[PDB]
Write an enzyme that holds these catalytic residues in place. Structure first.
Site, PDB file in Angstrom:
ATOM      1  N   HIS A  30       0.828  -1.206   0.000  1.00 54.83           N
ATOM      2  CA  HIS A  30       0.000   0.000   0.000  1.00 54.83           C
ATOM      3  C   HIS A  30       0.866   1.261   0.000  1.00 54.83           C
ATOM      4  CE1 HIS A  30      -3.319   2.525   2.163  1.00 54.83           C
ATOM      5  NE2 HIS A  30      -3.409   2.643   0.851  1.00 54.83           N
TER       6      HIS A  30
ATOM      7  N   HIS B  93      -0.532  10.804  -3.221  1.00 58.01           N
ATOM      8  CA  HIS B  93      -1.923  10.561  -2.838  1.00 58.01           C
ATOM      9  C   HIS B  93      -2.755  11.842  -2.761  1.00 58.01           C
ATOM     10  CE1 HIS B  93      -5.319  10.012  -0.023  1.00 58.01           C
ATOM     11  NE2 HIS B  93      -5.397   8.795  -0.530  1.00 58.01           N
TER      12      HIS B  93
HETATM   13  O1  LIG Z   1      -5.948   3.063  -1.714  1.00 59.35           O
HETATM   14  P1  LIG Z   1      -5.237   4.400  -1.614  1.00 59.35           P
HETATM   15  O2  LIG Z   1      -4.820   4.645  -0.181  1.00 59.35           O
HETATM   16  O3  LIG Z   1      -3.996   4.378  -2.462  1.00 59.35           O
HETATM   17  O4  LIG Z   1      -6.154   5.501  -2.084  1.00 59.35           O
HETATM   18  O1  LIG Z   2      -9.947   6.396   0.701  1.00 57.75           O
HETATM   19  P1  LIG Z   2      -8.935   7.343   0.101  1.00 57.75           P
HETATM   20  O2  LIG Z   2      -7.543   6.811   0.346  1.00 57.75           O
HETATM   21  O3  LIG Z   2      -9.178   7.456  -1.385  1.00 57.75           O
HETATM   22  O4  LIG Z   2      -9.074   8.704   0.740  1.00 57.75           O
END
Ligand SMILES: O=P([O-])(O)O
Ligand SMILES: O=P([O-])(O)O
Ligand SMILES: [Cl-]
Length: 276
Positions: free
Chosen positions: A16, A58
């Site tokens: 992850h 992210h």
């Molecule tokens: O699944 P995520 O944390 O990469 O959005």
């Molecule tokens: O659930 P999230 O990682 O897309 O904010």
């Protein structure tokens, strides 16, 4: 035409954001460590910069994970490369052991592909479809996969169905894609109407939490039902070895973990001949 993303007969173990529990998320420190710990690939996210480069990142803003501030979309790649993306990673002592250290820079998606050509990539298109970044990110994602000849080792998904739809219109099915929430809902409806005879025409990967609002999503019949529907079941947030083996035995095909150490343990348990 369909990409042979899945090879062998073992589920893929993804770290992850590169294994964010153990190393600063999305950094080379994380990707190197997860790869050493034996994962099959990296789950990750992409954000588009002001100069229209996809970075491995992210949040919409750099505030949480760097020493900078503001939107990724408002910064050039050059400006972003000056930041320390381990600046706020804390160990259980409360120290920030990687702040200011080497290999803590933001990575582009292109250099992720070139630097780890043996890793499978499970990538989430984060920019929203109504944003400018969202309108051009699917094409740039495909262009990046194409120039690195990585059609068969990248799985492209999104929370937003329209991003998957946009990407798949450009890729024309040559890259494995995730199953959207609405697409699986449509599948359950066609199943009920047609009986057990229905199945999705093209296999897509549906990644789930193991639980939601107290509901256990790891039932053996549910996983079998999805496989019967020609839907590839996958799970994220899998952070015990017993759950990993349980999902492997039930027929899950992708597993995202925050603890890449479990991958090495999982693989010593499976025969070497199941891998490709
Ligand atoms: O699944 P995520 O944390 O990469 O959005
Ligand atoms: O659930 P999230 O990682 O897309 O904010
Ligand atoms: Cl800044």
């Amino acid at each position: 035409t369909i990409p042979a993303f899945f090879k062998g007969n073992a589920p893929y173990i993804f770290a992850h954001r590169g294994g964010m529990a153990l190393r600063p998320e999305q950094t080379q420190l994380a990707f190197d460590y997860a790869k050493q710990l034996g994962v099959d690939g990296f789950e990750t996210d992409v954000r588009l910069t002001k100069d229209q480069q996809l970075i491995v990142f992210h949040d919409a803003t750099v505030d949480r994970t760097t020493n900078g501030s503001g939107k990724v979309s408002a910064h050039t790649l050059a400006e972003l490369k000056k930041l320390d993306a381990a600046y706020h990673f804390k160990d259980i002592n409360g120290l920030t052991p990687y702040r200011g250290h080497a290999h803590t820079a933001i990575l582009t998606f292109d250099e992720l592909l070139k630097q780890y050509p043996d890793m499978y990539i499970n990538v989430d298109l984060k920019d929203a479809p109504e944003s400018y970044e969202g309108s051009i990110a699917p094409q740039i994602m495909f262009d990046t996969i194409a120039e690195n000849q990585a059609f068969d080792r990248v799985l492209v998904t999104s929370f937003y169905k329209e991003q998957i739809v946009r990407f798949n219109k450009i890729a024309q099915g040559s890259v494995a894609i995730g199953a959207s929430q609405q697409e699986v809902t449509e599948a359950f409806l066609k199943y009920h109407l047609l009986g057990g005879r229905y199945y999705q025409p093209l296999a897509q990967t549906f990644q789930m939490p193991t639980h939601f609002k107290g509901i256990d999503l790891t039932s053996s019949r549910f996983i079998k039902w999805l496989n019967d529907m020609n839907i590839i079941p996958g799970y994220y947030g899998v952070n015990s070895i017993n759950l990993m083996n349980d999902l492997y035995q039930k027929g899950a095909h992708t597993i995202v973990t925050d603890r890449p150490d479990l991958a090495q343990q999982f693989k010593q348990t499976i025969p070497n001949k199941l891998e490709h």
